[PDB]
Design a protein around this ligand. Structure first.
Ligand SMILES: CNCc1nnc2ccccn12
Length: 119
């Protein structure tokens, strides 16, 4: 029933993601000195510190918006990878699976709380 509960749930999931070794390449914006062509391939950079800061600033209205930005971290890695077997892309796939496994109930609970609010 709680239409605000998603925010703390997302903070806790981000905390788990930050603790996970697989998130290290994604914790901060991609370094252009390390990957000079990055912005030729990627129009909208995204990283987990930006997601956490947007959430903490009160700049997400719903968990769907947070999801869209987290999914953009993963689609950027898929678009930038030179190979489906690259180390960083393989880390993104595991992290995506972990994220999707945990965000599912957050989205479901939010959408059902919102439907209850508008009943
Ligand atoms: C997150 N760092 C940029 C980036 N995103 N996908 C890949 C794949 C290989 C190398 C670097 N990559």
């Amino acid at each position: 029933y709680d239409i605000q509960a998603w925010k703390k749930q997302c903070e806790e999931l981000l905390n788990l993601i930050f603790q996970c070794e697989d998130s290290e390449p994604f914790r901060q914006p991609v370094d252009l000195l390390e990957y000079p062509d990055y912005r030729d391939i990627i129009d909208t950079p995204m990283d987990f510190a930006t997601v956490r800061e947007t959430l903490e600033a009160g700049n997400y209205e719903s968990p769907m918006e947070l999801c869209k930005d987290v999914r953009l971290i993963f689609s950027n890695s898929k678009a930038y990878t030179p190979s489906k077997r690259s180390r960083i892309y393989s880390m993104s796939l595991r992290l995506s699976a972990f994220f999707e496994e945990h965000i599912s109930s957050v989205l479901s609970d939010y959408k059902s709380a919102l439907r209850f609010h508008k009943r």
